[PDB]
């Protein structure tokens, strides 16, 4: 699904993203915009490390969801960082963003917070992001 700007804004608000782990709704808006153009079915393969970015927030398969084909995990068990969101990557390609939202919340629970996405740094950090939520009634 390709969300309209204010429609997404109202949806993220309802899903409790405003101020989640200190991140304003405008920053979440800035992130989705640059990551997918508000497209839930967006995917990007990284030839470089053999991982894929899924969905509206372009969540990577190396750490956050399982797609079975990305190299990198434990062989056996113990201190296991893989599929942190406990979801099939497919779940991040649905029109309903509840799962993508829950996963994005888990991502920012780590020290880097919203900095986990390089695009946020290049395109949103230290910028006036009010434009993304203006006139949406949020
Ligand atoms: Cl799933
Ligand atoms: Cl799975």
């Amino acid at each position: 699904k390709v969300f309209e700007r204010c429609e997404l804004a109202r949806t993220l608000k309802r899903l409790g993203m405003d101020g989640y782990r200190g991140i304003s709704l405008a920053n979440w808006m800035c992130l989705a915009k640059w990551e997918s153009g508000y497209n839930t079915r967006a995917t990007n393969y990284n030839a470089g490390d053999r991982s894929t970015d899924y969905g509206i927030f372009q969540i990577n398969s190396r750490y956050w969801c399982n797609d079975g084909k990305t190299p990198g995990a434990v062989t056996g068990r113990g201190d296991s960082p893989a599929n942190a969101c406990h979801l099939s990557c497919s779940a991040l390609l649905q029109d309903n963003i509840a799962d993508a939202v829950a996963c994005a919340k888990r991502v920012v629970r780590d020290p880097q917070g919203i900095r986990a996405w390089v695009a946020w740094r290049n395109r949103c950090q230290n910028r006036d992001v009010r434009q993304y939520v203006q006139g949406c009634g949020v």
Side-chain angles (χ1 to χ4, degrees), residues 66 83 85-92 94 99:
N66 177 47
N83 194 193
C85 293
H86 308 124
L87 292 170
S88 158
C89 301
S90 184
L92 307 185
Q94 308 178 62
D99 299 318

Side-chain angles (χ1 to χ4, degrees), residues 52-125:
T52 306
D53 301 318
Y54 297 90
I56 199 154
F57 297 123
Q58 294 282 281
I59 293 179
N60 191 266
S61 54
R62 191 158 297 292
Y63 319 95
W64 320 105
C65 61
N66 177 47
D67 73 354
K69 62 165 170 223
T70 316
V74 73
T75 317
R77 213 123 209 74
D79 292 299
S80 19
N83 194 193
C85 293
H86 308 124
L87 292 170
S88 158
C89 301
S90 184
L92 307 185
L93 303 172
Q94 308 178 62
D95 279 4
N96 178 281
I97 67 166
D99 299 318
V101 161
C103 186
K105 291 168 175 192
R106 166 79 198 59
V107 169
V108 297
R109 284 196 290 285
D110 269 17
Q112 286 197 278
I114 193 78
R115 281 160 177 67
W117 288 271
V118 82
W120 181 84
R121 284 171 212 155
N122 305 343
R123 313 278 177 164
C124 304
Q125 173 185 196

